[PDB]
Symmetry: C4
Subunit: 80 residues, 4 copies
Amino acid sequence: TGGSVHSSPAIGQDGTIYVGSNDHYLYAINPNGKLKWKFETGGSVHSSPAIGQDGTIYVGSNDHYLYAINPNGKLKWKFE
Amino acid sequence: TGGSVHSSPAIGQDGTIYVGSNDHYLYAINPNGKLKWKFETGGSVHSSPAIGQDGTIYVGSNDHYLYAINPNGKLKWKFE
Amino acid sequence: TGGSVHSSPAIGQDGTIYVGSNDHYLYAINPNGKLKWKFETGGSVHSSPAIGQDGTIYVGSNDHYLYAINPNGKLKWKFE
Amino acid sequence: TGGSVHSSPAIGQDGTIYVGSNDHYLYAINPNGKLKWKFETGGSVHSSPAIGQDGTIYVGSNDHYLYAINPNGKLKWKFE
Ligand SMILES: [Co+2]
Ligand SMILES: [Co+2]
Ligand SMILES: [Co+2]
Ligand SMILES: [Co+2]
Ligand SMILES: [Co+2]
Ligand SMILES: [Co+2]
Ligand SMILES: [Co+2]
Ligand SMILES: [Co+2]
C-alpha cells in the first residue's frame, strides 16, 4: 500500500480480504493477491474492518468518520 | 464523530454497528447510518467493542475502565 | 484497572470477559462486573486476547512475550 | 519474541496461535508453546492476523504490505 498496514484484515464469505492502510485507503484484495478495489478516506485507516450480514464493510478512519462501504467499493454512508 | 475512529466496529445480531471514538464515546449506529445512541466514557475509546451472548456491549477506555453497556445505551457496569 | 484499557475484550463461552490493560495485567471479569482473576505480565497488555478451543486465553504483552493463560488465571506458558 | 507483541493472536482450526511482533515477524506457535515457524516482514507487525477458509494467514506490516502466508510459513503473496 502507500503506508503502514496497522489495520487488521477481515475476510469476506467469498475470500476477499479487506484491510485499512495509513495511506488513508480501505483495500479489498482478492485471494490471489490482486486488487479488487480501494476506497479513499480522509485519514489513516487504523480501524480494522467488520463485515455485515449483507456484506457491507464498516471501518473507522482517523478523519473522524465511521465508513460503510458496499461490497463493490462504493460508499454507502459515513458517520462523523 | 468528534475524533479519530481508531476502534474497530462490532456488529450486533440486528445489524447495529458499535464503535468507539477518540472523542470519548462509544457509538451505536443503525445499518442505515443513523445514530441509535452514544455513551460517554472519560477518555479515548481505542478499544474495540465485544458483544456478549445477551447483547451486552463491552469496551475499554483510556480512562482505565472496562465498560459494559446495555443494548439501549445505558450503563450496566464499569470496572477500573 | 490501573491504566488505559487499549486491549479489546474477548468473551468466553460462559460469558467471562477477558481484556488487557496498560497496567500490565490481563483481566478476567465476570458478567456481573466482579473480578474473576488478573494476571500480571511485564508490560502493557495492548494485545487483545484470543480464546482457544479448550478455553486457553492467549494475549501478547509489550514485554515481548505471547502469554497462554489457563481459564483459572494461572500461567500455562509464555513465548519470547 | 524480539519485541512488543502489540498484534492480537488468531487461532487456527488445529489450535495454532498466530501473532505478530514489533520485531518484524509473524509467529506461528503450537498449543504447547513451541514455535512452529516465523516469517520476517520488513517492519513491525502491529496488524492482527486473519485466517482464510483454506488456512491462509493474512496480516499487515508497518513495511506497507499486506502479507498472505501459507500454513507452512512460506510466503504466498504480498500486496503494497
Ligand atoms: Co512507511
Ligand atoms: Co495521513
Ligand atoms: Co482529528
Ligand atoms: Co480526550
Ligand atoms: Co491514565
Ligand atoms: Co508500564
Ligand atoms: Co521492548
Ligand atoms: Co523495527
